[PDB]
């Protein structure tokens, strides 16, 4: 579908610079945004569709779980993000995010 791509692209573009908190390996949190992926918007949208539920949510026009989407796309595309992030805590976060946005 291409209308869901538009909504995903629009919600991601509006928040493209917004900083989100992800768990670190040292401790605490580090900040990340979509911009630091160094990826083109079209590529992020394409990758965001792997996140469970976001295509349905975008079809309905609901707010997307952007922190969960960013962490998902980053875990798959940024070797630096992978090395900064504690994956176990990221996993649980993205899981809890998707259950709240149900």
UniProtKB/Swiss-Prot annotation:
The modification Phosphoserine is found at residues 17, 78. Phosphorylated by host PKC and by an unknown kinase. It comes from the Viruses. A motif (Nuclear localization signal) lies at residues 18-21. Belongs to the lyssavirus protein P family. Non catalytic polymerase cofactor and regulatory protein that plays a role in viral transcription and replication. Stabilizes the RNA polymerase L to the N-RNA template and binds the soluble protein N, preventing it from encapsidating non-genomic RNA. Also inhibits host IFN-alpha and IFN-beta signaling by binding and retaining phosphorylated STAT1 in the cytoplasm or by inhibiting the DNA binding of STAT1 in the nucleus. Might be involved, through interaction with host dynein, in intracellular microtubule-dependent virus transport of incoming virus from the synapse toward the cell body. This is Phosphoprotein. It comes from Rabies virus (strain Nishigahara RCEH). The lineage of its organism: Viruses, Riboviria, Orthornavirae, Negarnaviricota, Haploviricotina. The gene is P. The chain holds residues 194 to 295 of 297 of the full protein.
């Amino acid at each position: 579908d291409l209308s869901v791509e538009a909504e995903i692209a629009h919600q991601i573009a509006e928040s493209f610079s917004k900083k989100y908190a992800f768990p670190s390996r040292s401790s605490g949190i580090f900040l990340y945004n979509f911009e630091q992926l160094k990826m083109n918007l079209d590529d992020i949208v394409k990758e965001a569709k792997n996140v469970p539920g976001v295509t349905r949510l975008a079809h309905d026009g609901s707010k997307l779980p952007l922190r969960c989407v960013l962490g998902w796309v980053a875990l798959a595309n940024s070797k630096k993000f992978q090395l900064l992030v504690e994956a176990n805590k990221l996993n649980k976060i993205m899981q809890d995010d998707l259950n709240r946005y149900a």
